[PDB]
A paper describes a structure:
Acetyl-CoA, propionyl-CoA, and butyryl-CoA are type I CoA molecules without a carboxyl group at the end of the acyl chains. As the acyl chain gets longer, the terminus extends to reach deeper into the binding pocket toward Loop 3, which might occupy the space for the incoming histone lysine residue. KAT2A has an alternative pocket for substrate binding. The propionyl and butyryl chain could flip into the alternative pocket, orienting the reactive carbonyl group of their acyl chain to receive proton transferred from the ε-amino group of the lysine substrate, allowing the covalent modification to occur. Thus, propionyl-CoA and butyryl-CoA can be utilized by KAT2A for histone modifications. By replacing the acyl-CoA with a hexanoyl-CoA model, we simulated the accommodation of hexanoyl-CoA which fits well in the KAT2A catalytic pocket, suggesting that KAT2A could potentially utilize acyl-CoAs with larger acyl chain than that of butyryl-CoA. The binding affinity of KAT2A to butyryl-CoA was unexpectedly affected by the Y645A mutation, indicating an additional interaction between the butyryl chain and the Tyr645 residue in KAT2A that was not noted previously. The interface analysis of the current structures showed a buried surface area of ~10 Å2 between Tyr645 and the butyryl chain, which is comparable to that between Tyr645 and the succinyl chain of ~7 Å2. Instead of the hydroxyl group that forms a hydrogen bond with the succinyl chain, it is the benzene ring of Tyr645 that is involved in the interaction with the butyryl chain.
KAT2A is the first identified histone acetyltransferase (HAT) and succinyltransferase. Here, we report that KAT2A can selectively utilize acetyl-CoA, propionyl-CoA, butyryl-CoA, and succinyl-CoA to directly deposit 18 histone acylation hallmarks in nucleosome. By analyzing the co-crystal structures of the catalytic domain of KAT2A in complex with acetyl-CoA, propionyl-CoA, butyryl-CoA, malonyl-CoA, succinyl-CoA, and glutaryl-CoA, we conclude that the alternative substrate-binding pocket of KAT2A and the length and electrostatic features of the acyl chain cooperatively determine the selection of the acyl-CoA substrates by KAT2A. Superimposition analyses revealed that all the studied acyl-CoA molecules fit in the same substrate-binding pocket, surrounded by the sheets of β4 and β6 and the helices of α3 and α5, indicating that all the studied acyl-CoA could potentially be utilized by KAT2A to modify histones.
Residue numbers in the entry:
A (entry chain G), E (entry chain D): 497 to 508, 513 to 662
B (entry chain H): 497 to 509, 513 to 662
C (entry chain F), G (entry chain A), H (entry chain B): 497 to 508, 512 to 662
D (entry chain E): 497 to 508, 512 to 661
F (entry chain C): 497 to 662
The structure:
């Protein structure tokens, strides 16, 4: 069906706001350990944005992120594809658009914390455990999950990702 | 008594508020005898300072005055006090827990403060540690230094309800 | 005689202020003979630069020229001078103490300046130190670097009165 | 014909500046044929990028595209080119010299650039070294990283104007 | 690949800005004998419009044209498809949308100058060397080119072109 | 029955009211039916073009005919675009009354020339309305302004402004 | 008798100008009885038309109705009349000179007119020729070719003082 | 000295321009004596006209008075003069060159003029020709065909820089 990618957020529109509830639902459901209250407060925060994957008008997931352009990196907050649509390449297409978007916006480092269950998806998206950004650049901006691995992805502004 | 919490401050944009701030400055000044009253009033009434108030029957009986540094990613704890005949009751801990809840909702997860030897044990029980994860390059020159006091730090878990 | 202090500047000037700046530019130039006159003019009349003028009987006799960097949490001292025949009467010190008082009230508590062989002993007596506590990462792209002079720092105690 | 120097940039209504930025983008993309044209064009027209432009008789013959990082105490040097038919005329040296002049007025005393094998000789001659005195924690994540090329620094001498 | 057509221009918007730069590049590169500045002056001239061919976000061709409603014709100014995309039909489709646009705006005559390497393309778009529009109507409005061949195309507003 | 002539059109500055708009649809229907080799999408585009106008023949409220035209007052002539009388009203002289009302309208607007293209099934009507195959307006004046039709005869009509046409 | 020349017309209004435009309509009609006075009134009152009026001692005694086609670079002479009791006094010629002068000052240098047989001598004397320099494509269908009427042209010299 | 080029013209307005226009009227008038001064002044101060003024140290030493007919696709060259003691230094050629650059910017790529016998060699060195590409229907009447003058044409190339 018609697949479409939109970067959306709760600015400073009905279809957008309902897409955001759709996203908040998909993060909660694929990310059980994340409290629903705190997924919601982040998804609906202005300083956060989300790349929404829309299959035929209906949200089937996306990537919630927080650009820190004073720092040169972007945090990756939530990632989920709905369970009946996983292992269809949908998550890689999501990351790649996310890369393209950040290319155009001169930001070329991703940082994220990964669980042991999900680390292999980030490895397969180019992420690495070798964190070249100085600790002093991110501590107190990215939400430390202690007991999860910090990972990093460097974007090349000269490859087309999409 | 009826207990209220309220975050307040001299916005550079109310009367119940104005006297609440006067009660805080009085409370802070009386519980912190080595803080110049003039200095206390200058910070409580500064606009980039906010103050969590604790109110028992309309009457200001404690609070945490604090300074949000959202660009630097932390908050400074300016004053803490519970008035004398309301101490040792758990009020201080309900203030700190509230103040934590606020700061999660505003996506700040670090408290920096300075502690003399008589307040270190208090902050320790609010979960403050001497080990400072925040880089000096980020707080020095923004937080009021206190040579002679232990700097302390608190990291918040936004997965968690404090109140 | 009748002395007064005023923190004047050039935003977007009175006749009274315009000539005061010109007076301040003259005093700065005369007491700093190897500073190009125009460079002094371009900073005294700069909008982001302010000046604490020292007036005696209506006439400019001294001043300190400074640039506040509240986003970086320090102020840059630019020019300091007392006219020839008013020196060594303490005018120098009260000019600093007034600037320290002004800066407590704006919660900037760090001065940074460069001092050549002809002024470091002045700055030593105003509490300046060669030990720079401010991060190099915080001022390098901001303050003019007078290579060949000694970078020096003053930290302010916002709890004591300076005047 | 008369020679001009002008530091221009994208901002927020001048036909002249606009066709000079296209002139620049063209000369950059011609002398850097292994860069994406879209990358050069997205940077030249970026408003946190500036470009020193070198004019001979109304049309662009050269320029230096750069990115000032005052809160880091240096400037990233992004693109350097003089057109073919005007090279080996000391033209690229006056560009680097006006750029130093401009930057000493603005209290930036460090240049950071990457240089491959075709360019490293020229930057050595304008005074750049491989000895990077800027801490890795001041520049990493701010300057466009180029694995494979060599990071070069140039340190400027401060000056009291007039 | 997601194909798009957009009739754009420089009214007196960044996406559109970078697109005109894309267009000015493609023109300049498929038309080496055209001054790069000259192409730039006409593409960024407000009374000029370019029909862009956008393939998966990037420009891969267009037609720059000049509508002369007073005179009752339009001037074809530049046509190019990027090298690796030629002989795929893109050119013919570009003309076909451009004929479609002009039907909807009551302009039913195209005029252009073509060198020998381009006569066949315009012949295949319905262009003829027989110029029905009077010389008084076009001379000193369309830029003439000593040497090239004046070519005319007449549109049927009762036909659908796309 | 009751007969009215109205010069109407898709005025793009005042809202064409419902009465006008339903007449613009009716004329589009009539032209389409009487001119079937003309695409109906073409007819609608032109009838509703703000630079076009239409003299509507209105009988007891319903549209029974019209002459849609385009005035080129810079060029000094007018194009005749569509002519139709509905079938059950033809050969009653309605065709001619429309043309004459149209001539009388144009001499008041100081345009004294009609140009049109006619195929063999229509050349006779326009001849009876005064058109000639002999075109005094120069080619440079009309070409690429009026919709050419190859295989139609271009036909011209010159109007005398000292004459009262209706 | 006091003689005035006024270029008037029915623009986008004045009592005096209105009664004059009627006075002109009369004179033209009466002097040109074989043109429908209906048609004369239309043109005289058309706003793209103008009439230079010959006012003698208050009353309208003649004039020239003309239509400027600036985009074409010519003016059409439409009606010319002096009332009867005032003919052969040179009034026709003074009207034509004031008209020439008027057009010089508007950068229009060509007059076209279709003339009946009873008029050719008057236009000849005013410098009109039957030899027509303007191209047919510039004037056809802007001025009305009347059958049996003679097109005449007058070309004007910007450097000549006509009045 | 300081040379400037200013396209000026009456606007249907500023003392510096007005005195420049009067200066231009004198320069033209003085170099072209057998042409009515009142005609030169009418044209210079007409608003459909513009003049490319050549200023050398405050004062008018020449210019090109021209007339853009953008409906018709060309500009009319009307008066070229350089004050007598500044001639044969190239001033009139920098004048035409500037005028060509101006017109390329407005998509007017043809200049028509009626040269007198003393002017022809100048127009020839500016690229003019007696072979007129522009159809007579496009210029006739719009410009004045002075008996004895030679119609000359210049086609501008918009891909070349002229200044
Ligand atoms: C602490 C918070 C940090 C965050 O931002 S959330 C951490 C990641 N989130 C989750 O795992 C939530 C639930 N999982 C999901 O929603 C999706 O499976 C997920 C991770 C978004 C991937 O989307 P999909 O469409 O399933 O992936 P895909 O079709 O594009 O295939 C990508 C390749 O990666 C591989 N992979 C490794 N670990 C995986 C894993 N844990 N889940 C899914 N795939 C994983 C998988 O083999 C897949 O195919 P291939 O091997 O490349 O051919
Ligand atoms: C440079 C200084 C700037 C600043 O940040 S202000 C520093 C703090 N200021 C002051 O303490 C001035 C006055 N202090 C007070 O009024 C109170 O002691 C204080 C610290 C406000 C706490 O208010 P309370 O309502 O009494 O707190 P609470 O009932 O929740 O009990 C806290 C538990 O911690 C324990 N504790 C250890 N050392 C303490 C200490 N020095 N002060 C208070 N409590 C202390 C105490 O036993 C109490 O109960 P528990 O052991 O947790 O069961
Ligand atoms: C590169 C940036 C350029 C600058 O702004 S740094 C240069 C500072 N300005 C100058 O050197 C301009 C000429 N000098 C002056 O105007 C004055 O001497 C100066 C330093 C501004 C202070 O004016 P005064 O009225 O003399 O200050 P004061 O009465 O409070 O003197 C108190 C104590 O200062 C002491 N001192 C040491 N070195 C000094 C020195 N180089 N200049 C002046 N005083 C100096 C002096 O001995 C006196 O001692 P004490 O306080 O009585 O124990
Ligand atoms: C990616 C981050 C930014 C970059 O690194 S962009 C890479 C540099 N760009 C390019 O190389 C593009 C193509 N080349 C050019 O545009 C110009 O040649 C270039 C490199 C800008 C130099 O400008 P020019 O005006 O041609 O040079 P110039 O006349 O001032 O001569 C300076 C002296 O340097 C010397 N040199 C050594 N290697 C060179 C080299 N690879 N390219 C040019 N000159 C080089 C050259 O011998 C000349 O000698 P001298 O000092 O005048 O005696
Ligand atoms: C003086 C300025 C005046 C102007 O308007 S610019 C004149 C055009 N300039 C240029 O063509 C220079 C570069 N050429 C190109 O960009 C493209 O080839 C061009 C001409 C735009 C056509 O785009 P394409 O995508 O290649 O065309 P297409 O696939 O639709 O092929 C249509 C048929 O045209 C035919 N044709 C004849 N000459 C051609 C020629 N020189 N280039 C391309 N095609 C040409 C060609 O055989 C092609 O295939 P077929 O005939 O259907 O079998
Ligand atoms: C390419 C687009 C050009 C255009 O403008 S559209 C061409 C005109 N429309 C059509 O051909 C299609 C449909 N026809 C009609 O609606 C009507 O018949 C038409 C042509 C509008 C005339 O309307 P009516 O009211 O019937 O005419 P009427 O009563 O005033 O006069 C009838 C007399 O005309 C005569 N006539 C000769 N050729 C004709 C011809 N080709 N079409 C119609 N009538 C024609 C017919 O013999 C009759 O004689 P009479 O004048 O009464 O003595
Ligand atoms: C623009 C077209 C308007 C039309 O419809 S035709 C315009 C002419 N209208 C008329 O003749 C109708 C009434 N006539 C008049 O009002 C006057 O005759 C007319 C033509 C306005 C001239 O007015 P006046 O005051 O009598 O003229 P004027 O004193 O300046 O004498 C000029 C010389 O014209 C001469 N002329 C030759 N043919 C003429 C002709 N057939 N009609 C009138 N005059 C004619 C007449 O002999 C007189 O003296 P001269 O012997 O040429 O030196
Ligand atoms: C049709 C427009 C209205 C007219 O009638 S324009 C009548 C032109 N003449 C005048 O206005 C009065 C007399 N002359 C002048 O004002 C000036 O000579 C004039 C024509 C404006 C030219 O400007 P200048 O600064 O004097 O001369 P220039 O140094 O720029 O160009 C001179 C080169 O052209 C050549 N030339 C041939 N006939 C000429 C001629 N009759 N006048 C001037 N130059 C002529 C001559 O070889 C000279 O050589 P070179 O390029 O200086 O090395």
């Amino acid at each position: 069906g018609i697949i479409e990618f939109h970067v959306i957020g709760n600015s400073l529109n009905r279809r957008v706001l309902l897409w955001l509830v759709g996203l908040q639902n998909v993060f909660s459901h694929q990310l059980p350990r994340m409290p629903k209250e705190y997924i919601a407060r982040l998804v609906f925060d202005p300083k956060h944005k989300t790349l929404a994957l829309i299959k035929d008008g209906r949200v089937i997931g996306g990537i919630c992120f927080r650009m820190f352009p004073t720092q040169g990196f972007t945090e990756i907050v939530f990632c989920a594809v709905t369970s009946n649509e996983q292992v269809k390449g949908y998550g890689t297409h999501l990351m790649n658009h996310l890369k393209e978007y950040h290319i155009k916006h001169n930001i070329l480092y991703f940082l994220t914390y990964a669980d042991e269950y999900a680390i292999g998806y980030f490895k397969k998206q180019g992420f690495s455990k070798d964190i070249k950004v100085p600790k002093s650049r991110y501590l107190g901006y990215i939400k430390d999950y202690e007991g999860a691995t910090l990972m990093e992805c460097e974007l090349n502004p000269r490859i087309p990702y999409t």
